[PDB]
């Protein structure tokens, strides 16, 4: 059994010059998790292809 | 009771058997009958 | 892994960028030392 989620997070992109277009890429990322053999977690890692 | 100790050894072992050597150090410059240390790491995180 | 999200990336960014807390790995460590002891002599309550 595996489950996993997306992360939705916001930082600006900011222009040395400042700017309001702060917005486009952004270090989101991708988890997953996995429960073992007494159902406790332990691979909740970050592949974020 | 058992069962439960023979899981909980089971769910580390496969960590172990997954770790992926990074370096080696050789001797400095020389060769033949070296000790030759090793470092590894999980690949699931950077942690170990 | 707490202590390392809190340092690894800044905490915020614009004119002023930063806020990675330089101690924090080494300050969890003492933490995750001591909890052994605890353990220890209370598996010697068990085992008295």
Known sequence: ???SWFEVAEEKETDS???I???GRY???IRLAHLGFDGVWSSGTTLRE | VAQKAVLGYLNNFEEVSNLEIIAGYQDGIDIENDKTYFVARTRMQPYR | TAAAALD????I???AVGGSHWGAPLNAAAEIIM??????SSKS???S
């Open chain 3, 45 to 47: 309550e068990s085992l």
């Open chain 1, 1 to 3: 059994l595996y489950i």
């Open chain 3, 13 to 15: 960014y614009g004119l």
């Open chain 1, 21 to 23: 277009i702060v917005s």
């Open chain 1, 27 to 29: 270090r989101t990322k």
């Open chain 3, 8 to 11: 690894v990336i800044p905490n």
């Open chain 3, 35 to 40: 909890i052994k002891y605890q353990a220890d």
């Open chain 1, 17 to 19: 010059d400042g700017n």
